[PDB]
Design a protein around this ligand. Structure first.
Ligand SMILES: Cc1nc(N)sc1-c1ccnc(Nc2cccc([N+](=O)[O-])c2)n1
Ligand SMILES: Cc1nc(N)sc1-c1ccnc(Nc2cccc([N+](=O)[O-])c2)n1
Ligand SMILES: [Cl-]
Ligand SMILES: [Cl-]
Ligand SMILES: [Cl-]
Lengths: 295, 290
């Protein structure tokens, strides 16, 4: 080809023949049906063709991490494929929709504490699985937490990250949803596991109040409110344990926020874990495996 | 009955009124107002296998009788649950008794008189090849007259090591043996480790193995390193504590070997009649044959 996008530069990857029919956008995300057996899945599309060499090697690294992750409270990965300059990730469809919608469907009626806590413990178990492996999740949001047909909570897998840039996170938040921005990101400090904990706190607060903790009339004032750490208090009819946990997740200094392992060690949360994980999984993930930044 | 089983069991008409949770429940008989404890086990959501094993466990509980084991009164089944009725020990649990010292150490004679009673109870269970998954200070009680009783609920005919580890990561982890930490088989000597934890609590008013996380607790237990007992306790007692915390199960003494140590043996007569001594130590044989 006498050239001066060369042909044969499109990447092709596939692991199976299964074909999917597009039904609908749902957010990025597409609802599909398999032509094999009519089962529904969600596909996330990422453009690849306009990435550098480096960015493609990092996306490949991210997908391999997604592809190996398995936990009952994380959306289950099915396969991926590449064609036409995009990467596509296929995952299971959660028939109960996202928590964002579930919160709005209350139309102002507050959830019972036992429901808030049963959902919350599941989100914590998922996040433990991610954080134990030293993976950051950039997308702990009520729009990225889903319910299965039997009511099980699943954290969206898409959004995991091996490392995150603070300027880029801040920019993404101006453009998309800003409600989960941590103080440290607002001050251009490193994104860390406690920044995930802040976002977890935002989700918990949404579940307690049906509202975002940090809202304001402008992006710039939203940033100042987040740094000040001042939010409308949760209803006093919720237990002291729950109200106090909300306050701890919103500590201004990351190192004062509890780790997800520490949250799960609080008695009123710990006593629920047994409903959600098998003895084998409890033993393996709380006791027998070792996790470290050393390899 | 055109389509597209609940069992009922009782042994007496006696009715009980719920007073308070203490799934153990404090109840009063409507007959004479005497207090009892009832443990409720849900049965309707068990498999075939699990129900056959629960029934086997309750039959073992129901036939057990010893002055230092909480006395089984009766059981009944209704509404998809099994209920076990036992005596209420008015003095409460040893856990509370230990905390009530508010840092004041027990006299060695008091430690040993309690300890011998726990050992006699555990001998009775172990002689019959029964494991006890719940040798804990929260499951050892004092009667109104000060007699020590090991809680019966918690006996087991076999125990799964993964399940025991899981239960500990969720409930109390302070009694976990090194072998269970390494996911190796639960055995009689694992009960001996837990007996050692109770003895240590009685000697120091603290747990032998504490840590800032479940994961680090596991590492401390395997290392076998614990704060030494006060040197004002006898050499006999301090040396016994060390033997019960041997890392390898087979190096821990059997409960029969513990009862044979002179400073313990001389107390047995206060707690068992001659007939019971002869029967427990000399005459009734048990064997894994079958
Ligand atoms: C991973 C993911 N990203 C989205 N965007 S949606 C989505 C996803 C994944 C699994 N299941 C679902 N279920 C679902 C059902 C109904 C509605 C919505 N929703 O995002 O408004 C989501 N959605
Ligand atoms: C078998 C049993 N399981 C319980 N849980 S409590 C219990 C039991 C059995 C016999 N007697 C008692 N007495 C008692 C009295 C007072 C306080 C407590 N307590 O465990 O806080 C227990 N408790
Ligand atoms: Cl964490
Ligand atoms: Cl051994
Ligand atoms: Cl033994």
């Amino acid at each position: 080809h006498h050239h001066h996008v060369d042909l044969g530069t499109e990447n092709l990857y596939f692991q199976s023949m299964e074909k999917y029919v597009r039904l609908q956008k749902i957010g990025k995300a597409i609802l599909v049906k398999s032509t094999e057996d009519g089962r529904q899945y969600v596909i996330k599309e990422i453009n690849i063709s306009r990435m550098s060499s480096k960015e493609r090697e990092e996306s490949r690294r991210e997908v391999a991490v997604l592809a190996n992750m398995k936990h009952p409270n994380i959306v289950q990965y099915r396969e991926s494929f590449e064609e036409n300059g995009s990467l596509y990730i296929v995952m299971d469809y959660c028939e109960g929709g996202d928590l964002f919608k579930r919160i709005n469907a209350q139309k102002g009626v507050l959830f019972q504490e036992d429901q808030i806590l049963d959902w919350f413990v599941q989100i914590c178990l998922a996040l433990k699985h991610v954080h134990d492996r030293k993976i950051l999740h950039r997308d702990i949001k009520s729009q990225n937490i889903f319910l299965t047909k039997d009511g099980t909570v699943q954290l969206g897998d898409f959004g995991i990250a091996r490392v995150l840039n603070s300027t880029v996170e801040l920019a993404r938040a101006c453009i998309g949803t800003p409600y989960y921005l941590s103080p440290e990101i607002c001050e251009n400090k490193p994104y860390n596991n406690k920044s995930d904990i802040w976002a977890l706190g935002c989700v918990l607060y949404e579940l307690c109040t049906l509202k975002h903790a940090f809202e304001a009339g402008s992006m710039k004032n939203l940033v100042l409110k987040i740094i000040s750490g001042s939010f409308p208090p949760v209803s006093l009819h919720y237990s002291y344990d729950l109200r106090s946990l909300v306050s701890q997740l919103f500590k201004r200094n990351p190192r004062d926020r509890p780790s997800v392992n520490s949250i799960l060690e609080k008695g009123f949360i710990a006593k629920r874990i047994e409903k959600f994980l098998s003895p084998q999984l409890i033993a393996e993930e709380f006791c027998l495996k070792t996790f470290s930044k050393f390899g």
